[PDB]
Amino acid sequence: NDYCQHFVDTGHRPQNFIRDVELIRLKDELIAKSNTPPMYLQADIEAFDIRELTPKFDVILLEPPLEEYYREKCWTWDDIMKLEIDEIAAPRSFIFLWCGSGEGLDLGRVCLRKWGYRRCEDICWIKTNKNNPGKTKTLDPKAVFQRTKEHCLMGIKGTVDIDLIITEEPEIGNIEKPVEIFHIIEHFCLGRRRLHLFGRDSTIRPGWLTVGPTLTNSNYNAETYASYFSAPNSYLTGCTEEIE
Amino acid sequence: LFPPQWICCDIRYLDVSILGKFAVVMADPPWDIHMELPYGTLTDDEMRRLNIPVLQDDGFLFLWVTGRAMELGRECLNLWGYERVDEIIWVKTNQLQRIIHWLNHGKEHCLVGVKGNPQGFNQGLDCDVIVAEVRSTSHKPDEIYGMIERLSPGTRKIELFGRPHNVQPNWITLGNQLDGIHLLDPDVVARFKQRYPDGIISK
Ligand SMILES: CNc1cc(N2CCC3(CC2)CN(c2cc(F)c(CN4CCC(C)(C)CC4)cc2F)CC(=O)N3)ncn1
Structure with a gap:
């Protein structure tokens, strides 16, 4: 069957028909034991000196609020590219950059290179419309096709899961990204200093430092935070037992 | 001419200016992806130098x-x-x-x-x-x-770097494992005869 034709016929996206969309439970349980307390800081990242965020991070998840997320303060790729991300990333570290579905797939690669990473994975969040087949999409002027996915670029600097997330398209104006991206990241066992830039009250999570303008509360303290990673815990992956 | 057409050639050396202009170009090129592959690859410079712009x-x-x-x-x-x-x-x-x-x-x-x-x-x-x-x-x-x-x-x-399973009406398919030269569009046929009077593409 040709599901592209079917989408033309009915309005059901082809991804609506993908099916199925203690093994790796020690992992997860080891992750949960390893996790630092959740930590969070309200900060206007535009006006904020990013270098106050210490220590250097093993993983950075970067989720800038793109204009395209508001179909019905936006950050342009001009703003994002000017962030000093390389100033806070560890010499060996990883970045996960939500890039949207338009020009961000190009400018986000420029950003990754600008900050010193190379792309090693491209994770696509594929959005089903099983609940509103009869909801046509209002296209970007340059679009050739209806855009039904977002890309999260994985980048590496220095020396179980699939690259797809499938969920239903959120309601209009819901900008949340699927929480599954956190599972993929934590399953990589990349180290324990994890930073989420442009997170929200609703994304705060154990094992993560969340920084963003709309946080209603803070508990960040750089000395307290650094203390979770002082010896003997400096090089844990986040997937092993705590050191007695 | 609507039915399928193709040209067996090395896309590096074919003079693509004889083909005219197209509404859609598609390519699945044999990129050098820095792994060992069962087919021959084109270097980065050969890819850059492909005469896509005239198409x-x-x-x-x-x-x-x-x-x-x-x-x-x-x-x-x-x-x-x-x-x-x-x-x-x-x-x-x-x-x-x-x-x-x-x-x-x-x-x-x-x-x-x-x-x-x-x-x-x-x-x-x-x-x-x-x-x-x-x-x-x-x-x-x-x-x-x-x-x-x-x-x-x-x-x-x-289509560039197509194979025989890829031939389609409205498409001209180029690839080095195609069966000869099969051209039906009279503009292309004329330009092909003029540029290649002995049916051979070399340099
Ligand atoms: C030297 N100059 C030439 C060369 C040339 N071709 C003929 C055709 C060519 C390469 C050489 C096709 N090739 C091949 C096989 C592949 F898997 C891929 C990768 N891709 C990735 C995306 C995908 C949808 C998964 C599908 C796969 C790309 C490929 F190009 C195998 C082959 O044997 N030949 N034609 C004219 N001139």
């Missing part, structure tokens, strides 16, 4: 990319004069619709480039996700031809 004035380019070609393909696309305006992914399933370095790969990527000011195309009919079964390894999914036909019905199209 269109106003239309769309469909460019399959994997690995480091996700980046190199974007470079070639811009060098040849295109802006990347979309990106199609093909979710690979089995016959029961289940999905087949750091992550296992469930998809393949096709960049969509635009050149000039295309007019009369049907933009927005299809969406940018293909769900289809791996009918054979190394093969792109046939659905891409349907989406391109609905996007630009009846127009002239050219």
Whole structure:
């Protein structure tokens, strides 16, 4: 069957028909034991000196609020590219950059290179419309096709899961990204200093430092935070037992 | 001339100016992805130097990319004069619709480039996700031809680095494993005779 034709016929996206969309439970349980307390800081990242965020991070998840997320303060790729991300990333570290579905797939690669990473994975969040087949999409002027996915670029600097997330398209104006991206990241066992830039009250999570303008509360303290990673815990992956 | 046409050639040396202008170009090039492959590859410089620019004035380019070609393909696309305006992914399933370095790969990527000011195309009919079964390894999914036909019905199209299974009405297919030269469009046939009077492409 040709599901592209079917989408033309009915309005059901082809991804609506993908099916199925203690093994790796020690992992997860080891992750949960390893996790630092959740930590969070309200900060206007535009006006904020990013270098106050210490220590250097093993993983950075970067989720800038793109204009395209508001179909019905936006950050342009001009703003994002000017962030000093390389100033806070560890010499060996990883970045996960939500890039949207338009020009961000190009400018986000420029950003990754600008900050010193190379792309090693491209994770696509594929959005089903099983609940509103009869909801046509209002296209970007340059679009050739209806855009039904977002890309999260994985980048590496220095020396179980699939690259797809499938969920239903959120309601209009819901900008949340699927929480599954956190599972993929934590399953990589990349180290324990994890930073989420442009997170929200609703994304705060154990094992993560969340920084963003709309946080209603803070508990960040750089000395307290650094203390979770002082010896003997400096090089844990986040997937092993705590050191007695 | 509507029915399938093809040319067995080395795309590095064919004079593509004899083919005229196309509404859609598609390529699944043999990129040097810095792994060992069962087919011959083109170097980065050979890819850059391909004479894609003479093939269109106003239309769309469909460019399959994997690995480091996700980046190199974007470079070639811009060098040849295109802006990347979309990106199609093909979710690979089995016959029961289940999905087949750091992550296992469930998809393949096709960049969509635009050149000039295309007019009369049907933009927005299809969406940018293909769900289809791996009918054979190394093969792109046939659905891409349907989406391109609905996007630009009846127009002239050219595929580079195609194989015999790829020949399609409205398409001229170029590849070095094709069976000879089969050209039916009278403009192309004339230009071919003039440029290649002995039916041989060399330098
Ligand atoms: C020297 N100059 C030439 C060369 C030439 N070709 C003829 C055709 C060519 C390469 C050489 C096709 N090739 C091949 C096989 C592949 F898997 C891929 C990768 N791609 C990735 C995306 C996908 C949808 C998964 C589908 C796969 C790309 C490929 F190009 C195998 C082959 O044997 N030949 N034609 C004229 N001139």
